[PDB]
Design an enzyme around this catalytic site. Structure first.
Site: not given
Ligand SMILES: CCCCCCCC/C=C/CCCCCCCC(=O)O[C@@H](COC(=O)CCCCCCCCCCCCCCC)COP(=O)([O-])OCC[N+](C)(C)C
Ligand SMILES: CCCCCCCC(=O)OC[C@H](COP(=O)(O)O[C@@H]1[C@H](O)[C@@H](OP(=O)(O)O)[C@H](OP(=O)(O)O)[C@@H](OP(=O)(O)O)[C@H]1O)OC(=O)CCCCCCC
Ligand SMILES: *[C@@H]1O[C@H](CO)[C@@H](O[C@@H]2O[C@H](CO)[C@@H](O[C@@H]3O[C@H](CO)[C@@H](O)[C@H](O)[C@@H]3O)[C@H](O)[C@H]2NC(C)=O)[C@H](O)[C@H]1NC(C)=O
Ligand SMILES: *[C@@H]1O[C@H](CO)[C@@H](O)[C@H](O)[C@H]1NC(C)=O
Ligand SMILES: *[C@@H]1O[C@H](CO)[C@@H](O)[C@H](O)[C@H]1NC(C)=O
Ligand code: BEF
Ligand SMILES: [Mg+2]
Lengths: 1084, 327
Positions: A392-394, A670, A672, A773, A779, A803
């Site tokens: 994950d990013k955020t 991610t 986002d 997105r 995911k 996640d």
């Protein structure tokens, strides 16, 4: 369809809403808000645990021995002490799996007791989350988590407005505005009226479509439709709203985020599957040896056994029946090739190895007081075999902190370390903000050249540049106690407003037609004439205001690309500003170009009327508004740009490089938007100037070409460097995831399988892949594709509920702990607070765990074949009668007392290199990637090692016993002395072998190895009996003769010396990566 | 939760020794072993050869041998006379054994056929033999005293040696039957039934084994050498490890004077053929060996030590050149 009613918990308990189960269970359609992440609730522990205990091959093999030992005509044991050994071994794993599950029983409690507020009587009363039921009317406050999927009914903000952050539900870092229905807004404000609210909602059945929602509300004899803009999902957090009111629609497992969590699956290691293949092979070997020896006994009994008068047992058993009846006798005798300690030792090793993760001070985050946590004690050596990391990013790669760094004005970059009017030295003290009344210490700024310019005023464009940041934003401000606290929907504007506040251009208050910005302490109240909305396609927003003097000026800020298409022909700073942006872009900072233009009084009036016409329009006002927006923005005088840093977690770029050197591919999945995801990719160093970025359009051309080509060659040249930035919308398209009926389906699956394979082949050719997105289902879909089409061991690291699906789908799932949210941590296998601890989890804990597990398996099957195969060689010298070469009391203690501890400590303490030195050389991890320590081939080498050891352990003593061996009154030339000589040589040989396997000789390792040998030679000298008395005599005869000891010494030497030569020859001709480091350890 | 404890074990930084299988440390152990095993093997081989041994097979399977008449003993008491000569006199204590070939005393169905409790002098087990000795529990109506196949199939020949001197009169050789079993077996493992003074009244309600001619009452005249504590019986019950074995039979003690115990000359073995072994291709032997301070006569260990000693030294050279090549 779904049906909900307000303040009515008996409507949903009607008989016709009970779905009913096949086996006498109701299972109401409406789920209670209580969640469940554990496995064994009250009494499903036994059947469910033994079901997964017996997924191991050996457990079924041990159970076969129990059935075989219960048959009287072949039974060797009482059958009341062969079951207890198995139950204890099963019980050891049962307890170990119960303490792990009790931990996640407590995790549910802290989330099921979150004590929200509910209408269960005339007025609101406090109630836990688990006490929430569909149809309840609840109240939330600032920063409160949403207990379930609710429908806005009211809030203190005007128009029942409500802001919620969805970082839990997607990767987005900005707030979403939620609004209630107009009728519900004005009639459900006061707390008392909420209690009497009786509205009936017919909405869609529970789903996983976070983006959209469908339904209707019937109330006050009128029907009102609903959409996703009125629904707060469970993972949200209420922000910038003192309180709000909702009506629970879904709850618990029915919540729209809990339907996105995947299916919890029983995760097994790659070596766990390997162990099954070794037990299957040993079972076939055991059956073949026993059947071969049985045929020998049948033939031996034909001519030798029948003629032997002394071998008369008064049974008319034909040689064929005796051979058949001894086949089971040799199954029991030779069963110790897979002993009952196989999994007691594995679980003791894994339990200790998992607690080193928990105990690690280098994986302990002091700031949040969050130590690492191995919350499953069964997947440890798989950390040493990871092929892909899906991140994950955020919140995983980022701290969700966004800070003002620099700023450009008229081609001059301000923000670098500077003092006075010219750069002097890199070491610059912190800027003094005391000159500004409103400023505070949050902004860490090192630039004094900018401070003089703003105060001096010799460059008026500088002052107008920062004044833009205080007007062009759209955030509200709280002046509850004069602190001027800022509440920004977008953190970009929150940081800019905070930064611009410290520069003297502080924004004080907002009004529908005026603003109260203060310019360097000067109170100037502007008039708002028109605010141009912000939207994705426009990529820029503007504001039209009238100065106090009377002039009208347009202030715009947004993406550089769009603005550069709307600049005046005369713009000397256009080229210089472009260069400045490249400097910020190369520094991985978000640049918002600032521009303005002059609007005349007559020019505004003609445009003003059209703007009002678009606003008052009811058909396509959004389209109409964009029409007027383009007309006004034709020639813009570029002013400059800003710079904002999306603060990564420290140690993230250094972790990705080290794991890259270990040949681990890191994909960022991610939720986002693309621009944020790509920007963080450059910050993490996943993308560099060398990388050529390929988007969904570029990938689609290649994959479609490959299918046409067939109607394998690499999609890119081997020497290139490439990365994929694929949007979740594009992911469905490229993967085709957007009677003749049965016939066509096979072709439909035919190309879909081909299309998925092509993408994974393309995706895995790239240095980095960033999926943006992507929904939580997507995911896990991406992790599944790599698992399926590449047969790779995958790790998933993330935070939040989006996640959970991929954390549960990956081979290893990691949750980021320490924060307010814990949805991912509950469903994860390992938990630590900082991404940078992924270095030690893999390159230290996972790498060692793989080495320590492979050395255990290599020795464990060596020392059991060496022990057991002696019975096979003795068969040719006893009539194939299934007589044991050892004393009956040595066989029981061998696997518990004489060869148990030394391998366990080696499985817990061995280290090929130091942790400091295993992080310095990530390439050592690559040995577990390719699975080199322990193959199926290395398994047979340990069988050959144990087969040849049993050859020496039996035939060197046999040569000495065929001849005179201390023939005196006290002659040890009998079976008992023959038995204690092989046992003595076996115990020394195997315990010297583990000493040769051990590379980290801790004092406990030395004590166990010599203690195991001393314990054997202490037990068989009546020392154990002496101690019991304080609290038959064979050993005192066999072990006192020089020949018996010369036989033992010779047998041990022949067993060990060839091993030392082979180990030395392999180390000196084919040194491993570790071996080179150990030789040069001091020099390093 | 709170901070982890900064313990050496918990932080995986326990003090340790990292041995490396380096050339300077493994080459010695392949040479010092070679220099130690070679002399040991030579010492074993040389001393074993110095032991003088005569092995005489009296099964009589072949014709033209003076014992073939007892393979079909029409009369139960049969006797054989085998003549042998010693090249040089035996010095020191000489041990007389008997060897049985192709006799699987290690067979699983055979080794279990005993009652250790009964042989230990348990009154409960005296009249209640365990089911392990199943085929030989009860003979007619009462239990066998030494139940089991091992006690039933006891070697029951009688071997005698005679020296033939100048006068040609065969001089008998004194043979000591005491002290031929393990000390523990005499005093710990094997014990007579409790109570009484006369063995007749101790073994009441028990019969002899079916294959034995006489009961356990008078296995030997000496009260200390009959019963379950008989030397010959105990020596037999200590089951061998391999099909071919030897069991100590009698001891020849050093003579009071300085003359050799068994002076070289003409000898005759007068054996009472009782034990039949020819059905399963069994061989019966009589062995005489001289006592040696360092073990018995084990030529296999001497050869094995030299072979392993030479290979270890040879491995050192082969490993030395390999290490030098890759240095
Ligand atoms: C000085 C310093 C050095 C000290 C080192 C010594 C450390 C000692 C500490 C030992 C504590 C145990 C630690 C875990 C060891 C590894 C796992 C394991 O061995 O489980 C064992 C579980 O045992 C059984 O299943 C039953 C074994 C037979 C019954 C009799 C055992 C007890 C005898 C009472 C007397 C002994 C009491 C011993 C316990 C106090 C493995 O059993 P097994 O043998 O594989 O079963 C045979 C295989 N078969 C079923 C396939 C045929
Ligand atoms: C003379 C024996 C020849 C045996 C066949 C040839 C050698 C053989 O296959 O191994 C038999 C096993 C080996 O048992 P080992 O525990 O020694 O297994 C190996 C060893 O660990 C080496 O290092 P490593 O890589 O595992 O870290 C490995 O080197 P590598 O993988 O680089 O090639 C070698 O392969 P190698 O053979 O060198 O290519 C393996 O044999 O048992 C013994 O060590 C001796 C048992 C015999 C005891 C004496 C018998 C008289
Ligand atoms: C020496 O030991 C051998 C065995 O090693 C003895 O031979 C065995 O003698 C018994 C009888 O004492 C035989 O059992 C049965 O004997 C009756 C007659 O008494 C006979 O009718 C049965 O058919 C059965 O044979 C047994 O078979 C026999 N064993 C063999 C292999 O022939 C021998 O008697 C012992 N002699 C002395 C002097 O101790
Ligand atoms: C064996 O010796 C005895 C007595 O010395 C003698 O009577 C007999 O003939 C000898 N037999 C053989 C074959 O030498
Ligand atoms: C051999 O021993 C028997 C048994 O005591 C005896 O009768 C005989 O005289 C001895 N001499 C022989 C067989 O030459
Ligand atoms: F936190 Be990720 F961006 F979904
Ligand atoms: Mg996140």
């Amino acid at each position: 369809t779904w049906q909900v009613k307000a303040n009515d918990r008996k409507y949903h308990e009607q008989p016709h809403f009970m779905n009913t189960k096949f086996l006498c269970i109701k299972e109401s359609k409406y789920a209670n808000n209580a969640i469940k992440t554990y496995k064994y609730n009250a009494f499903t522990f036994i059947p469910m645990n033994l079901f997964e205990q017996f997924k191991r091959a050996a457990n079924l093999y041990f159970l076969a021995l129990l059935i075989l030992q219960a048959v009287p005509q072949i039974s060797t044991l009482a059958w009341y002490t062969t079951l207890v050994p198995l139950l204890v071994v099963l019980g050891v794993t049962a307890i170990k799996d119960l303490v792990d599950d009790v931990a996640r029983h407590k995790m549910d409690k802290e989330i099921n007791n979150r004590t929200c507020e509910v209408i269960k009587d005339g007025r609101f009363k406090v109630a836990k989350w688990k006490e929430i039921q569909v149809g309840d009317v609840i109240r939330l406050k600032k920063n409160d988590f949403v207990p379930a999927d609710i429908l806005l009914l009211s809030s203190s903000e005007p128009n029942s407005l409500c802001y919620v952050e969805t970082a839990e539900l997607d990767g987005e870092t900005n707030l979403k505005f939620k609004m209630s229905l107009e009728i519900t807004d004005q009639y459900l404000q006061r707390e008392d009226t909420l209690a009497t609210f009786d509205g009936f909602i017919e909405c869609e059945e529970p789903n996983n479509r976070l983006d959209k929602f469908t339904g209707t509300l019937f109330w006050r004899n009128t029907s009102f439709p609903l959409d996703a803009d009125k629904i707060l999902l469970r993972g949200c957090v209420i922000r910038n709203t003192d309180f709000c009111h909702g009506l629970v629609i879904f709850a618990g497992a029915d919540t729209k985020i809990m339907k996105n969590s995947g299916k919890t699956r029983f995760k097994r290691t790659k070596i766990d599957y390997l162990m099954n293949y070794m037990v299957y092979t040993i079972f076939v070997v055991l059956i073949l040896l026993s059947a071969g020896l049985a045929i020998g006994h049948a033939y031996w009994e034909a001519q030798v056994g029948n003629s032997s008068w002394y071998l008369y047992d008064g049974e008319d058993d034909t040689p064929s029946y005796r051979g058949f009846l001894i086949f089971w006798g040799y199954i029991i005798v030779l069963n110790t090739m897979v002993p009952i300690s196989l999994y007691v030792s594995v679980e003791v090793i894994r339990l200790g190895q998992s607690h080193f993760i928990n105990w690690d001070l280098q994986m302990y985050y002091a700031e949040k007081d969050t130590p690492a946590k191995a919350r499953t004690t069964t997947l440890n050596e798989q950390l040493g075999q990871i092929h892909y990391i899906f991140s994950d990013k955020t919140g995983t790669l980022t701290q969700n902190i966004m800070t003002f760094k620099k700023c450009c004005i008229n081609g001059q970059i301000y923000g670098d370390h500077r003092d006075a009017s010219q750069h002097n030295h890199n070491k610059i003290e912190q800027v003094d903000f005391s000159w500004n009344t409103y400023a505070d210490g949050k902004l860490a700024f090192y630039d004094h050249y900018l401070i003089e310019q703003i105060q001096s005023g010799k460059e008026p464009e500088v002052r107008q540049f920062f004044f833009l940041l205080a007007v062009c934003h759209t955030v509200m401000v709280d002046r509850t106690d004069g602190q001027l606290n800022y509440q920004a929907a977008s953190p970009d504007e929150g940081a800019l407003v905070n930064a611009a506040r410290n520069f003297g251009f502080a924004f004080l208050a907002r009004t529908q037609n005026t603003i109260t910005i203060s310019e360097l302490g000067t109170e100037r109240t502007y008039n708002v004439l028109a605010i141009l909305d912000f939207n994705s396609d426009r990529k820029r927003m503007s504001i039209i205001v009238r100065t106090p003097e009377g002039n009208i000026k347009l202030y715009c800020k947004g993406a550089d690309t769009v603005i550069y298409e709307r600049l005046h022909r005369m713009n000397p700073t256009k080229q210089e500003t472009q260069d400045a942006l490249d400097i910020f872009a190369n520094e991985t900072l978000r640049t918002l170009c600032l521009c303005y233009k002059e609007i005349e009084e007559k020019e505004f009036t003609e445009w003003n009327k059209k703007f009002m016409a678009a606003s008052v329009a009811s058909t396509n006002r959004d389209e109409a508004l964009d029409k007027v927006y383009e007309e006004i923005e034709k020639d813009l005088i570029l002013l400059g740009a800003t710079a904002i840093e999306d603060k990564l977690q420290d140690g993230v770029p250094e972790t990705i490089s080290k794991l890259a050197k270990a040949d681990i591919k890191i994909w960022v999945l991610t939720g986002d938007k693309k621009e944020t995801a790509e920007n963080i990719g450059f910050a993490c160093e996943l993308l560099t100037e060398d990388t050529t970025i390929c988007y969904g359009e570029d990938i689609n051309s290649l994959l479609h070409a490959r299918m046409e080509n067939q109607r394998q060659e690499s999609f890119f040249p081997p020497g290139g460097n490439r990365a994929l930035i694929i949007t979740g919308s594009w992911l469905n398209e490229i993967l085709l995831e957007k009677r003749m009926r049965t016939q066509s389906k096979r072709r439909l699956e035919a190309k879909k399988e081909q299309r998925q394979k092509n993408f994974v082949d393309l995706a895995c050719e790239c240095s980095a892949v960033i999926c943006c997105r992507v929904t939580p289902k997507q995911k896990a879909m991406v992790v599944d594709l790599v698992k399926r089409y590449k047969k790779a061991i995958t790790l998933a690291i993330g935070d939040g509920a989006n996640d959970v699906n991929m954390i549960k789908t990956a081979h290893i799932g990691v949750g980021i702990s320490g924060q307010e949210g814990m949805q991912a941590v509950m469903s994860s296998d390992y938990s630590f607070a900082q991404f940078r601890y992924l270095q030690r989890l893999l390159l230290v804990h996972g790498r060692w765990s793989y080495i320590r597990m492979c050395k255990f398996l290599r020795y464990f099957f060596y020392k059991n074949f060496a022990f057991t195969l002696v019975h096979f060689w003795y068969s040719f010298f006893n009539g194939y009668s299934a007589q044991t070469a050892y004393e009956d009391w040595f066989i029981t203690l061998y696997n518990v007392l004489y060869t148990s501890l030394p391998v366990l400590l080696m499985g817990l303490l061995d280290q090929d290199v130091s942790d400091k030195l295993s992080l310095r050389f990530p390439g050592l991890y690559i040995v577990g990637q390719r699975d080199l320590l322990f193959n199926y081939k290395r398994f047979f080498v340990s069988l050959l090692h144990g087969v040849l050891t049993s050859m020496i352990l039996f035939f060197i003593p046999l040569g000495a016993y065929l001849q005179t061996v201390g023939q005196d009154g006290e002659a040890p030339s009998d079976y008992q002395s023959f038995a204690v000589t092989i046992a003595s040589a076996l115990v020394i040989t195997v315990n010297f072998q583990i000493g040769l396997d051990t590379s980290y000789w801790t004092f406990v390792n030395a004590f166990s190895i010599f203690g195991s040998i001393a314990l054997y030679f202490g037990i068989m000298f009546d020392f154990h009996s002496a101690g019991i008395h304080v609290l038959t005599g064979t050993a005192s005869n066999a072990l006192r003769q020089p020949y018996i000891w010369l036989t033992i010494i010779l047998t041990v030497a022949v067993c060990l010396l060839p091993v030392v030569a082979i180990r030395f020859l392999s180390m000196t001709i084919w040194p491993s990566e570790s071996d080179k480091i150990q030789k040069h350890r001091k020099r390093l | 939760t709170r901070r982890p404890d900064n313990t050496a074990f918990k932080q995986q930084r326990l003090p340790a020794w990292q041995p490396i299988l380096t050339a300077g440390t493994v080459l010695p152990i392949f040479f010092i072993i070679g220099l130690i095993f070679i002399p040991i093997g030579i010492g074993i081989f040389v001393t074993s050869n110095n032991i003088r041994e005569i092995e005489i097979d009296y099964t009589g399977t072949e014709p033209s041998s003076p014992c073939n008449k007892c393979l079909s003993p029409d009369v139960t008491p049969c006797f054989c006379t085998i003549n042998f000569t010693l090249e040089k006199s035996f010095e020191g204590n000489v041990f007389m054994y008997y060897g049985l070939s192709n006799f699987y005393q290690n067979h699983r169905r055979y080794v279990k056929s005993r009652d250790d409790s009964q042989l230990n002098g348990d009154s409960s087990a005296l009249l209640n033999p365990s089911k392990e000795c199943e085929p030989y529990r009860r003979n007619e109506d009462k239990p066998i005293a030494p139940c089991g196949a091992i006690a039933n199939s006891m070697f029951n020949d009688t071997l005698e040696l005679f020296l033939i001197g100048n006068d040609s009169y065969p001089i008998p050789i004194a043979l000591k039957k005491k002290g031929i079993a393990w000390w523990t077996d005499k005093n710990v493992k094997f014990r007579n039934p409790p109570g009484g003074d006369n063995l007749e009244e101790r073994f009441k309600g028990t019969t002899k084994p079916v294959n034995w001619l006489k009961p356990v009452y008078m296995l030997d005249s000496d009260p200390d050498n009959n019963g379950f504590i008989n030397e010959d019986f105990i020596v037999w019950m200590r089951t061998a490890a391999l099909p071919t074995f030897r069991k100590l039979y009698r001891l020849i003690e050093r003579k009071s004077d300085l003359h050799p115990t068994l002076p070289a000359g003409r000898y005759s073995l007068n054996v009472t053929y009782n034990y039949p072994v020819h059905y399963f291709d069994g061989r019966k032997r009589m062995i005489l060996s001289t006592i040696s301070w360092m073990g018995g006569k084990n030529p296999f260990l001497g050869i094995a030590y030299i072979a392993v000693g030479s290979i270890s030294f040879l491995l050192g050279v082969v490993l030395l050149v390999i290490n030098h090549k890759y240095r």
